[PDB]
Write a protein that binds this ligand. Structure first.
Ligand SMILES: CCCCCCCCCCCC(=O)O
Ligand SMILES: [Cl-]
Ligand SMILES: [Cl-]
Length: 174
């Protein structure tokens, strides 16, 4: 019944980069193929005078053969015609960390409590996403209040992802 075409997904009306700046703690993640950020994931958003949004992120990543390292990542956001949809160029402060360019959508936020982010890296031929990821962010590292949690669950369902998240732990690893 429900529409899972990426082209159908609503995103945050009149998204305000300035209001979104500051520290966001990842509470939950839906992983893409070949997942990178594992847990202890914290993002820092900024906007400069030209209106350009950028971010840094810290988190544990586990490169294969199970060697744990705290990745330090950088992202810069190129605007699109939709104020809530961006292209995010990202890299690690270390050369060998994963680099790339992903769609970065702010699906919903109230700026001071919760955010829902979404990226489809690759479409299916029917317009659904073949390879997606999504972060749920909280301003408070101890988690969302119930009213926000309930809104977020609705958005997770609208993205056709609600069954597919895992919780992100924060235990000072970094
Ligand atoms: C919120 C901006 C984060 C900086 C870009 C790093 C994001 C790349 C990792 C996301 C995909 C994954 O973690 O599997
Ligand atoms: Cl609930
Ligand atoms: Cl579920």
């Amino acid at each position: 019944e429900r529409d899972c075409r990426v082209s159908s997904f609503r995103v945050k009306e009149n998204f305000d980069k300035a209001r979104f700046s500051g520290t966001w703690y990842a509470m939950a993640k839906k992983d893409p193929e070949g997942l990178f950020l594992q847990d202890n994931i914290v993002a820092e958003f900024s906007v400069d005078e030209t209106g350009q949004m950028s971010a840094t992120a810290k988190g544990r990543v586990r490169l294969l053969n199970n060697w744990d390292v705290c990745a330090d990542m950088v992202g810069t956001f190129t605007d699109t015609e939709d104020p809530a949809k961006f292209k995010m160029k990202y890299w690690g402060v270390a050369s060998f960390l994963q680099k790339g360019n992903d769609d970065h959508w702010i699906v919903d936020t109230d700026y001071d409590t919760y955010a829902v982010q979404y990226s489809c890296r690759l479409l299916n031929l029917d317009g659904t996403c073949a390879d997606s990821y999504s972060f749920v962010f909280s301003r408070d590292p101890n988690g969302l209040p119930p009213e926000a949690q309930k809104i977020v669950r609705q958005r997770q369902e609208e993205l056709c992802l609600a069954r597919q998240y895992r919780l992100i732990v924060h235990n000072g690893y970094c």
